[PDB]
Structure formats: C-alpha cells, structure tokens
Design a protein around this ligand. Structure first.
Ligand SMILES: Nc1ncnc2c1ncn2[C@@H]1O[C@H](COP(=O)(O)OP(=O)(O)O)[C@@H](O)[C@H]1O
Ligand code: BEF
Ligand SMILES: [Mg+2]
Lengths: 9, 95, 95, 107, 93, 621, 82, 98
DNA sequence: AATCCCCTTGGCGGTTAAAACGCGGGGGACAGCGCGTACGTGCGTTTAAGCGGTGCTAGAGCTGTCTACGACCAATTGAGCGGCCTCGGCACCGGGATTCTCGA
DNA sequence: TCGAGAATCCCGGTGCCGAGGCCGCTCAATTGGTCGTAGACAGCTCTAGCACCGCTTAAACGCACGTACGCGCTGTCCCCCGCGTTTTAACCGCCAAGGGGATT
C-alpha cells in the first residue's frame, strides 16, 4: 500500500 | 600423439591418459608440503607410478566391498573401510 | 628476483598451515574412474567417496615425500631423486 | 543310515566339522551357514597344498627326502605371492635367504 | 589332556602332493601355526564383513569375499575357484 | 543431552487438533509418511482423548509412536513461522501505518532530487517515488528489494539513494556487486550523476587486486563506494577477508536473481560480507519457483529468518506439486508469502508508467526445415527414442537449429583420409594418425570445416557455400535481415550456442552485413567499447549477442529489432534479452522476432515457455 | 637376588654375527651400543605385553603362548611355537 | 711370509656362512639373564618356561637381522660400505619405530 | 579348598670353546676443489577447472511376507588322539681331491 | 698368467633318535526332529549421480636465462680388520627343592 501513498504525498 | 591441442580449437577433447592429470606443479606442491626444498626432474614419473599403485590398491578393496553388498555405487564408507584395511584409518566420515 | 629458498619456506609454511587439497578435483576423479573401470565396468561413485580417496592419496604422498627428504639428507644432498623415493618405499615395505 | 563326514561329501581332506566348531566357538557371528565351513576348509586345503608343493621341491633341491623349517622358509620367500601373504611372519629356525649386495663384492 | 592340531590333515595333503616326501616335527608345528593364522585371518575378515552389512550369519559369500580381499593375485583366483567347486560338490550330493 | 521429553499440554492440544483437522496432503507433510499410516488416521477418528488417541494409534497395526513426535516437530516448525508471521505482519504494520500519515499533511516527506546530483539531469517521477520508498524503508532499518522492471533506471535510483546518504552525513564505504559485463557502465554512471562519490573499481587480476588491497589498507585514499563483480568478491580468501574486515553500510547487488540458489557457493560466500544493510536490484524476482523467492528473502532479511532456514526450505521444497496438487495450507502460505514480501519488494511496470515508450510486438516465425534437415532430424529422433546418453533433448535442439552442429557430411572414411594426409604438415609430422582420427571423431562438421580452412594440405575438403546455408532458420533469417536492412533497421541477434553464433558469423559474411559480436570469450575490458561502438557507429547492422553474457545489463537503445534465433527453456533469459533494447530512451517500436522450427522439440519448449509466462502473469496480479 | 649388567651379555662378536647374517660387510665401532639399546627397547616392549597377558590369566609363569600373542599383537607373528 | 688375507675377504666368507646356517647367533645364558633382568622391573618373582625364552630369542634375532639389512641399505645409499649409528637411526625413523 | 608331581630354579664341577686384549696396516671415510648442467624463477599465452543451471533416471534405501535355514536336542558311532615300538634318514668324522686367494 | 697354501666339496662309513605305523578308546562329529526368526524377494519412493551447456579466471605451459648444486678427482689419516695369545664362563651332565597349575 506504500506505493499508493507515495504518489499521495 | 594427436591434434596438438594448441591451435586446434576443439569444443570437447578425447580426454585419454589421465595419469598426466596429476600435473608436475601439483607434485611440487605436495613435495613442498613434505618439506622438500629442491626436486629432480625425474621425480614426476616416479610419483605418478607410486600414486597409481596406491590408488589401484585402495580401489580394488573398495570395489570388492561394494560388490559384496550388491551395490553399484562405491560409497564413502567403502573407501574408509578399504583405507582402514591398509592400516591407514581415515577420520572425517567415520571410524 | 629473490634467492631460491625464501619462497621455499614461504610455501612450506603456507601448505603446512592449510588442510586444503593440493590436487585439482576433476583430473583426480577422471583418474579414479579410469583405474576403477578395469575392475568392474559400469560403476558409479559418490562425491564424498572420491573426496576421501583424494585426501588419503594426498596424505600418503606427503608422508612419502617426508621420508624421501630424510633419505636425501642422508646422502648429503638437498635435491630429492628417484633413488631416494625407492629407498624410502623399500625400507617402509611397499617393495 | 551310514554316517559320512561332510569332508568326504565335499571332496576335501581338511575337516569340516572341526572348522565349523571353531567358527561357532570363535564368536565371529551368531549363526554359521552351511557352506562357510566347506568353503573355509577348501581354502585352507588349497593354501596348505601349494606351500607343501613348493617346500617339497625346495627340500628335493638339497637332496633331502624330508621337510624342515629351512625349506619352508625357502619356499615362502622365493614365491612372490606367498612372500606377499606371509611378509610379516617369522618362521622359526628358518634363517635368511643368501643375498649379498652388489658393491660388497671385491673390486 | 587332549589337544587338537592339523598334523594328520597336513600329512595327508603332503602325501597327496609328494608321495615320497616326509616332514619333520618343527615343520609340522610351523604348518599348524600357519593354518591357524590363516583360519583366524579369514574368519575375522568374514566376521567384520557380516557386521558391516548388518547381518548376523557368516555364509559362503562372506568367506569368498574375505578370500578375495586377503589372498593376492592368482592365489585369490585359484582359492575362489576351488572353494566354489567344493561347495558345489557338497551341495550337489 | 538425551532426556525423556515430556509432552506439554499445549503441544498435546495442538497435535490433537491438527491430526483431527489436517487434510490427506497435510497428513502427508508429517515425517515418516508411510502413506498407509496417514490413511489410518482417518479410520482412527474417534479422537476420544489424547490418551485415547495414543491408544488408537498404537492399536492400529502398522504405525509407530515417533509419528506423534514427528508431527510435534512439524507443528512446532510451523509455529516457528507463525510467530515470524506475527513478527512479519507487524513489521509490515509498523511500516504501513507510517506510510499513511505522510499523506495527511499538505507537504510530506518528499525527498527531492539531491543537490549532489548532476543539475543538468533530472529524476523522473517514478524514480522519485522509488527514492522516497528506499529512504523511508532505510529509516526503519530494514532491507528491501527494488524489483522494478527491466529498463526503469534501477541503477540511477540506487546512485541517487547513495547521494542522498552522502548528503545526510553518511559517507561510509558502501559496496556494489555487479555482473561482469555491467561493471564499466556502473563506473560511468556513478560519475555522470554523482561525481562527489569517491569510487574504487576493485577489479582485475590477482596482482592488480593485491595492489589495490595494499593501497587501501595503506589508507592511501579514502573511498565511499567500492564496485566489484560477483567472482572478484569471492574468488580468493584474501578478498573475502578484505570485505569482512571492512566496515560497510550498504551492500547493493545488481541482478539479484543470481542469488536465486540458496546452496550455490556464491550465496553463503556473499552472506559472509560484513554489512549493516543490503539492497537487491532485480527485474525478475520470481523465476520458476517460490523457494527461489524464499532464498532471496532469506538473503535480504537474514537475521529474522537466519535460525529458521531449515523450516522454510523444507516447507517450500514442494516444487513437484501442480497448481491443484498444492494443499490448502500451501496456497495459504503462498498468499501469506506475498503478504510477507509486500513490504520488502517494490515493483513498477513500464507499460503502466512510461506511456511515452512505444509498445512491443512479436513475430513467432515457424521455420520449415529443409528436406535434408528434415531427414536428419527424423533419423536422429528414431536413433534416440530407442535408448548415459543425455542426448535426448540437447542434441535434438541441435538438429533443430542447424544440421552442422553434429557430424553427418564427414564420414569416418574422410576422417581417416584427412588424418593420414595431415602428416604432410610441419606441426604434425611426428603426429600419430591413429589418434588424430580419434580426435577428429568428436569434432563437428563445422569444426572440421574450420580445420580444413586452417591447414593447407586439406583445403580440398571445404564444404560448399550452399550446404552451410542450408537451414530453415537461416532461410527465414536472410529474408528478414534483407527486409529490415531495406527498412533502415538495426538488428540485435541472439543465440544460446557459441557454435551457432560462429555459423551466424559466416552467414552474415556471405550476405556482407557489417556486424559486431559479444559472448563470454570477449575480454571484460573492451565489452563497453564494443557496446559504444555499436551505439555510435550507425553503419554496423547486426549485433551478435550470446544470451548469458550479452543479455544481462547492457543498454542497446540504438537498435529496434531483437531476433531470438533460439529461445530458452527459462523464458526470463529471453525477457531480459528482449528488454535490452526496450528501455528508457528508445524511440522506435521495438519488434521482437522469435525463430521456431516446425514440428520439433522447439514447439514443445515454446508451449512450456508460454505456460510459465502465464503462471507469472497470474501470480503477479 | 640382584641381576645386573647382563645387557653386556649380548657380546660384540654376537652382534657381528647378527650383522653378517644381515649382509653387513664392514661395521663401525659404535654400532654395538646402539644395537644393545635397540634390543633392550624391543625386549622391554615385548615383555610388557607378555606379562600383561600373564596377569590377565592370573598366573605366576609366563608361557610361550603369551609371547606369541604379544608378538602377534605387535604385527610380528612368529610361526613355530603354537 | 705368513699368509694374511686381504681385509674384507673373511668378512664375505662369514656373510656366506652365516646366511647359509640357521642356528641361534646369541648364547643362551646371557640372553636368559637379560630377559630375567627386564622382567624384574615390571613385576617381582616371575617364572619363565624355557620355550618363552626361546621364542623371545627367535623374535629378537629376526628383528635385529631385519634391522641390520635396512641399515646396510641406508649405508649403501650414502655411497659407503661401513654401517654407522646414523644409518640405524635413519632406518628406525623411516620404518616409524622411533 | 586340599593335594600332586612335574617342571623350573638353583647348585657343583670341569673343559674347552669362545670372547677379550693387542697390534700392524691398509683401505675406506671425509674434506676440499672445480666444472658444467640442470633446476628455479620470470613472463606471456592458453587452457581447462570450477561454478551455476537444467534435466533425467538408475539405483540406494526402506517396508512387509513368509520360506527356508540354522540352532538346539537326543542318541549313535567311528575318527582322531595318546601310547608304544621300530627302523632308516640324517648328523658327524675322516681321508682325498678340488677350488679359490695371493704374492712372487 | 702362475705354484703354494688354506678353505671347501665329495664319498664312504656309523649309529642314533625321531618320523611313522599299529592299536585301544573316548568323545566329538553325524543323523534325524522340531522350532523360531533371518533374510530373499517383491514393490515402491525419491535422491543424487551423471550428462550437457556457458562464463570467467586463475593456473598450467612453453621458453629464456642464469647460477647453485651434484658429481668426479685428489689426498690424507684414522679406524677397522685379520691373526695371535690368554682368560673365562657357557654348557653339559648329574642332583635336590619346592611351588604352582591342574585335578579331586
Ligand atoms: N533518470 C533517467 N533519465 C534519462 N534516462 C535514464 C534515466 N534512468 C535511466 N535512463 C536510461 O536507461 C539506461 C539505464 O537503465 P538501467 O538503470 O541500467 O536499467 P535497469 O534498471 O534494468 O538496470 C541508461 O542508458 C539511460 O539512457
Ligand atoms: F536491469 Be536493467 F533494466 F538492464
Ligand atoms: Mg542494470
């Protein structure tokens, strides 16, 4: 799920 | 003697006369292990003959042990057993 | 260039310290299979079997070279010669 | 019925009952087969016969009709395979083979 | 007290080999010691052969393999041949 | 010491529950299987009581008490993983919470492009995403796997990550272990992006390596990054001592799929490296087996699986099972394995991010082998199907490729004549013809042709030019290369056999195309010069590349048609080879053309390759 | 009583005879003490095991069979005494 | 002029005579006294049957003859005809006895 | 445990065979010197070992039956063992001839 | 290449003591039963031994050169051998004690 939040910064 | 390995560029070799596979640098390494400082040029044939005799003596006994047990593969217990039969018991795989 | 004899002690100590094999594995394995082929055809070998064979052969050759060195120093020499090897074997009893 | 020794049946001269008893009482194994005493008696007979033949020849060489330990020593130490088999044996009253080195002769 | 030895058997073998050759007492004792030593050697080799294969019964096979191990060269060949012949004759009748 | 082991009540209950509810396959997992013994468990189903359970087991003839011990181990071993599961998911959870609160703020921990990097060059957005991922996963003191697909810039990402470390006051020597054909490029990149880093290329012969060792242990110069190969880090015990007694912070490993085997000597030799952290770069983390990925996970996170390796390898040693033959617990372990690796392994896919890269095509060319090759193939198949002799597969693909890979046109008669006639040569005046014939027996027809061309007295025995170009693959390849030359294309041509590449050289010489060639025989030093020569000179048309060497990590943005003259049993060698050209910076729609022989083992290998590819496509989603 | 100095009972001419039977043609004057030492070592080693066997059989007499067993155990089997 | 033999010839004659014969080359009483001395040290008041001493004498003579053959070989190796203590020590070292 | 007789320990004396002591001399050990050749080292070239990877299948290794073989017992008996003669094979002596060493 | 002398072999005669044959009597080997378990055999699993390939790299090899050591020749001196003379102590023959291993 970290890849998802990476663009969600 | 053959194609003269140098310059022929084969993919696979016939690979005969394997006693020469005990190269003289290896024999020198063994002698220097043994404390020998300088080696004559005729030691190499003598050492190859000695090694061949010793190997035949051990392998005959190992194959005898293997044949008795109805097997087709020479195990390591067989080699240890043939060595122990020679008064040269080897430790590392059993006793 | 250095004198022949410093390398002597260097390699003697390096080889006496290490218990690693001084012969290349594939040539010795080919030789072992060649020798054993003359006793029973279509034979197989465990890897640890040929490993034990090689270790025993190396130890035997080292001991023989030590005895050869003693017999050479007896004749007031530093070079070992085939006569030294045959003398060592004949006093030991192999001949 | 009529008793026949196992040695007579196997065509031997060495006993098979005595060899079998020695095999049993030696604690070599818990059970002893039926051909082990016969095979062992045959092997012993062969070895005895060969050494006796060689020793008889060696005794004939010295113009004697009897065998003494010297002739056994000569027979064993002249044959290569018997020398290998009995390399680590001291035959009593046997002596030594006559053999002088090359350089010890006068020059 | 009774004592057992192979004097008579070696004497019969000798008379089969050389019909006009005797043997002294010392050579007789040497032959007795020889036969006992060979018996002990072969029996010990066969016993350890049995113990190796986790068996508990010495048979013709262990004796044959011990003979092959101990006797060098042609001696092993002839000993194995004559032993097999003796076993075959014993079993056949 | 050996003592009486008392069954604890909790283990009694666990064993009873497992034996009550395990499946037939699960019951098989218990050691001392004797599958009738596992079957008797179903019959012995009262499960009356633990003592009653022992009563039933002992009363059923054909069972052993040690089974209760054996399952006792199994559950315990499984319990070993369970706590690790509990440790692992929280390791995920402790991670997966902190990854969330950064989105709450208007601006979060977006680690921008370091000032150390080349200002004229800029990171791409997904590379920045990966950089942030690496930085944060380091901040919790873990090791990851950067499993980005082939060509996304993993090298650039690693170099920028190291530059970020150097910005944060971490100048510790950090290693890099690279494949042999790639090392030059690495030394090129670490400069062009991050010249501030002091780089030591610890490579070369034992003499040069010993010189480098003497200089560094002299503290002659301070170094931040040491770049080495896979062999030069392991070859000598001196090198192993050097890398153990240094203090290293990051051990980055390019192409980590070389560490797929847990028993390969390089593997444990590489765990001997002293290092606070390690990082793995790979484009294909899972190749053909889950135990391979498990070995990678053990390597990257050793301490948390170090003592439990024996459990993992055995439970993942079920490679022989099929998809449905997998027990329910095995499928559960596969899913929870994906849930164990999800914090460690990051993957991005080019078609999903790099919209500017043109897509890829394929052309499976079925090659009708000619009459002579067809007769030879059928004859050799008939000879082998009857029957040592590993020839069942390899020397069947050899006739699939080219008839000249064996010896058919040089009968023993010609060999005897040549052996007796070459006595006229000076180098073999003393030679023994009876052994020359023995040597010439094991030599193939093309090798014999090369020999004939080499010596003057036997120049009579050259093969005609038509015979050496008699192949279905050659026949289709000539037309394809002519078509692509007219189209103004550049071709990268692969083959798995060195002798096949040698014959390809002759064929290209016949069609007078200019070409380069790289295989494992080429010296390491000038491989980069060859690559640059192809990338700059636009008159070189064909680039022959052996799959093992010329396939790993080089940049071939110049060409736009990749031909596979022969495909691999393992499709990932092919995938790496195809994505050599299809990477960042490419400007043409990269075509991939596979050559396939009609009606041979080649079709079966193609089918198995497609099945494995579809298995990956399913497991990755 | 007291027994002493019988290692000199292995005289010099007896050593020369043993050497002649072994093929030796010329003998240095220092061989004699060396050979006496070697012989005493051998005899002590063999007698140790012979008396070990005798004590294992719990007898006050050492027999020829104990000597034969001791020699055989040392790889020096002696034929002709049992 | 008294007839003396050249030095060495009588030594070869003795070699031949003593390699042809098979009797014991050491006196009985001194050897018995020696074995009794060596046995006194291990335990007191032992008793020896005659064949025990005879077997010990046979074994000792065989041992010494074999050792002297090996010593002769070691002496011939060093291009000498005289046997020296160093020859015996070399033989006993090679055989492993010391 | 009591007892026995047979073998080992110890003793006397003599004789005479072997060992100890002495001495010249010769021949071999041993140190030195000098040539010359063969072994060690250095350098470039190649060549194969070693490692990884893929696949296949013989054969080791284990279990379960049950058939035969080997152990244990009883009674029978005749082969070997100890004993006691008895004669010839061999150790020994004595004379003649032969052969080997050595100094003219 | 030779005469003399010392060692050696050959032949014949002698007698003595141990190999060899005959005999009575155990007592171990043989023969016939029964019983228990050891291993021969069939079958099955899966493991590891072997065959093939490529890559890489270090070791093996071929050659040049030089110098250290092995072997031959020389001289000397010292130590061992052959022969002679003297002492001494082994060896044999006969006799007594007693204790220790075997038998009851
Ligand atoms: N940030 C970037 N900007 C431009 N080009 C890049 C960037 N990163 C990589 N490339 C291109 O990709 C190539 C390097 O790819 P590489 O990182 O070796 O792929 P992999 O990650 O499979 O090893 C270089 O030749 C370069 O041209
Ligand atoms: F791993 Be790079 F994409 F060749
Ligand atoms: Mg890369």
């Amino acid at each position: 799920t970290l890849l998802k939040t990476s663009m969600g910064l | 003697k053959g194609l003269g390995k140098g310059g022929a560029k084969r993919h696979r070799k016939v690979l005969r006369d394997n006693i020469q596979g005990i190269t003289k640098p290896a024999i020198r390494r063994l002698a220097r292990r043994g404390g020998v400082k300088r080696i004559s040029g005729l030691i190499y044939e003598e050492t190859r003959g000695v090694l061949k005799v010793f190997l035949e003596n051990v392998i005959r006994d190992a194959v005898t042990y293997t044949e008795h047990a109805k097997r087709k593969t020479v195990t390591a217990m067989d080699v240890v057993y043939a060595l122990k039969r020679q008064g040269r018991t080897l430790y590392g795989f059993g006793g | 260039r250095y004198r022949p004899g410093t390398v002597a002690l260097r390699e003697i100590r390096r080889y006496q310290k290490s218990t690693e094999l001084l012969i290349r594995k594939l040539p010795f394995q080919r030789l072992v299979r060649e020798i054993a082929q003359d006793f029973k055809t279509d034979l197989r070998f465990q890897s640890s079997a040929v490993m034990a064979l090689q270790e025993a052969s190396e130890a035997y050759l080292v001991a023989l070279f030590e005895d050869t060195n003693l017999c050479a120093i007896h004749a007031k020499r530093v070079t070992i010669m085939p006569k030294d090897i045959q003398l060592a074997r004949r006093i030991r009893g192999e001949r | 019925a009529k008793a026949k020794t196992r040695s007579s049946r196997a065509g031997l001269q060495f006993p098979v009952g005595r060899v079998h008893r020695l095999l049993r009482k030696g604690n070599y194994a818990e059970r002893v087969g039926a051909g082990a005493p016969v095979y062992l008696a045959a092997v012993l007979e062969y070895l005895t016969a060969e050494i006796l033949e060689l020793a008889g020849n060696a005794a004939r060489d010295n113009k004697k009709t009897r065998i003494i330990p010297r002739h056994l020593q000569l027979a064993v130490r002249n044959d290569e395979e018997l020398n290998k088999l009995l390399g680590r044996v001291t035959i009593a009253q046997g002596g030594v083979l006559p053999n002088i080195q090359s350089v010890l002769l006068p020059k | 007290t009774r004592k057992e030895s192979y004097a008579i058997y070696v004497y019969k073998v000798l008379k089969q080999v050389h019909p006009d050759t005797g043997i002294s007492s010392k050579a007789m004792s040497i032959m007795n010691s020889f036969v006992n030593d060979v018996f002990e050697r072969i029996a010990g080799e066969a016993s350890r052969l049995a113990h190796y294969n986790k068996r508990s019964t010495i048979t013709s096979r262990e004796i044959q393999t011990a003979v092959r191990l101990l006797l060098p060269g042609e001696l092993a060949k002839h000993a194995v041949s004559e032993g097999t012949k003796a076993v075959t004759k014993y079993t056949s009748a | 010491s050996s003592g009486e082991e008392v069954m604890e009540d909790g283990y009694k209950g666990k064993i009873l529950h497992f034996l009550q509810d395990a499946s037939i396959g699960e019951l098989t997992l218990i050691p001392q299987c004797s599958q009738k013994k596992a079957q008797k468990i179903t019959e012995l189903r009262p499960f009356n009581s633990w003592e009653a359970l022992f009563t039933k087991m002992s009363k059923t003839n054909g069972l052993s008490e040690d089974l209760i011990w054996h399952c006792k181990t199994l559950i315990q071993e499984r319990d070993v993983v369970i706590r690790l599961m509990n440790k692992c998911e929280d390791i995920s959870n402790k991670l997966t919470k902190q990854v969330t609160m950064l989105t709450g703020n208007g601006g979060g921990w977006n680690i921008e492009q370091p000032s150390i990097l080349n200002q004229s060059l800029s990171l791409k957005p997904y590379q920045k995403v990966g950089l942030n991922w690496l930085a944060l996963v380091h901040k919790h003191g873990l090791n990851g796997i950067l499993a980005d697909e082939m060509g996304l810039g993993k090298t650039i990402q690693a170099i920028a990550f190291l530059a970020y470390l150097y910005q944060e006051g971490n100048n510790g020597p950090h290693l890099i272990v690279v494949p042999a054909s790639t090392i030059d490029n690495w030394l090129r990149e670490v400069n062009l992006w991050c010249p501030t880093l002091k780089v030591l290329c610890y490579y070369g012969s034992q003499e040069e390596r010993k010189q480098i060792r003497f200089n560094i242990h002299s503290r002659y110069e301070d170094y931040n990054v040491i770049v080495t190969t896979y062999n030069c880090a392991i070859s000598s015990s001196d090198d192993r001592s050097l890398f153990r007694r240094l203090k290293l912070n990051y051990a980055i490993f390019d192409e980590g799929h070389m560490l797929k085997n847990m028993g390969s000597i390089r593997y444990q030799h590489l765990m001997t490296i002293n290092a606070n952290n390690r990082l793995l770069l790979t484009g294909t983390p899972v190749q053909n087996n889950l135990l391979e990925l498990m070995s990678l996970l053990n390597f990257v996170m050793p301490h948390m699986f170090s003592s439990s390796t024996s459990e993992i390898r055995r439970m993942f040693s079920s490679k022989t099972k099929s998809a449905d033959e997998q027990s329910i617990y095995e499928k559960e372990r596969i899913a929870h394995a994906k849930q164990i690796i999800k914090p460690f392994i990051l993957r991005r896919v080019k078609e999903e991010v790099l919209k500017q890269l043109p897509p890829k095509k394929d052309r499976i060319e079925l090659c009708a082998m000619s009459e002579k090759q067809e007769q030879l193939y059928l004859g050799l198949f008939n000879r082998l199907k009857k029957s040592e002799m590993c020839n069942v597969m390899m020397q069947l693909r050899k006739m699939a490729n080219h008839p000249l890979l064996h010896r058919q046109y040089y009968t023993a008669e010609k060999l005897k004549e040549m052996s007796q006639l070459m006595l006229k040569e000076p180098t073999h005046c003393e030679a023994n013809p009876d052994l020359i014939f023995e040597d010439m027996e094991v030599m193939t027809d093309f090798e014999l042709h090369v020999l004939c061309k080499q010596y003057r007295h036997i120049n009579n025995f050259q093969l005609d030019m038509d015979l050496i170009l008699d192949s279905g693959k050659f026949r289709v390849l000539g037309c394809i290369l002519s078509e692509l030359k007219q189209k103004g294309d550049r071709v990268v041509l692969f083959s798995q056999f060195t002798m096949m590449l040698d014959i390809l050289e002759v064929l290209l010489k016949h069609h007078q195309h200019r070409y380069l060639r790289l295989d494992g025989k080429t010296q390491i030093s000038e491989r980069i010069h060859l690559i640059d020569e192809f990338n700059t000179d636009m008159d070189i048309f064909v680039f022959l590349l052996s799959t093992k060497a010329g396939g790993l990590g080089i940049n071939l943005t110049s060409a736009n048609v990749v031909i596979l003259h022969d495909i691999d049993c393992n499709p990932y060698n092919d995938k790496q080879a195809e994505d050599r050209c299809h990477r960042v910076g490419q400007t043409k729609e990269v075509l991939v053309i596979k050559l396939i022989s009609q009606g041979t083992i080649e079709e079966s290998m193609l089918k198995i390759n497609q099945q494995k590819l579809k298995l990956e496509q399913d497991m990755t989603t």
